[PDB]
Design a protein around this ligand. Sequence first.
Ligand SMILES: CNc1ncnc2c(-c3ccccc3)[nH]nc12
Length: 148
Amino acid sequence: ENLYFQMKHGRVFIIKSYSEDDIHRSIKYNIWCSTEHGNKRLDAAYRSMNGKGPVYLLFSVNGSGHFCGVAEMKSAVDYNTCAGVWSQDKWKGRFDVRWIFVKDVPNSQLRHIRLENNENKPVTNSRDTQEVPLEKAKQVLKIIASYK
Ligand SMILES: CNc1ncnc2c(-c3ccccc3)[nH]nc12
């Protein structure tokens, strides 16, 4: 058995990226940036966590059919940074992450976990910075960690 993930202090968000380049840049430099409203959502979660648990980010390139990895948020959002570092010059700011897992996990492995906070839609049909209830996030993390 693996009873590791079955902890009550942690918050977990879906990250959608239009760009494979942004994923590569995030993995290379351990940084990320979302939309304005996505940044505010993540920043609020990171700050109210106050180091008492992780904020996990589950990354998926839009339309790709698979998740591509897992990162931990490692800083609050800096909203005034160099512009144009991502594929679109549509992102304002920067925060630190630490990539934990870089591996492709097909949506078929996860489509049966549904989100009660998002109309019971499959976790694989989430939008950018959709938050995942902790008890569903535990199931997703265990599937990602064991996939091969
Ligand atoms: C630099 N970070 C990013 N790069 C590429 N797409 C991003 C999104 C997104 C927003 C709406 C729909 C799908 C994706 N949010 N942050 C993104």
